[PDB]
Design a protein around this ligand. Sequence first.
Ligand SMILES: CC(C)CCC[C@@H](C)[C@H]1CC[C@H]2[C@@H]3CC=C4C[C@@H](OC(=O)CCC(=O)O)CC[C@]4(C)[C@H]3CC[C@]12C
Length: 31
Amino acid sequence: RRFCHYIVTMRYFEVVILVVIALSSIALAAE
Ligand SMILES: CC(C)CCC[C@@H](C)[C@H]1CC[C@H]2[C@@H]3CC=C4C[C@@H](OC(=O)CCC(=O)O)CC[C@]4(C)[C@H]3CC[C@]12C
């Protein structure tokens, strides 16, 4: 499964992680 895990890190994964980081930061600021 590890090769699939490696390919997951390429499927525009960094942009999705960046977006979720930004949105969760905004959620932190919205409390
Ligand atoms: C470049 C980076 C470092 C700056 C990114 C900006 C955001 C981190 C900040 C800027 C202004 C902030 C907003 C300022 C005030 C509010 C109102 C706040 O409360 C409400 O929705 C009011 C309604 C209610 O009181 O029921 C929700 C979060 C929000 C949009 C904040 C969310 C976080 C924001 C977008």
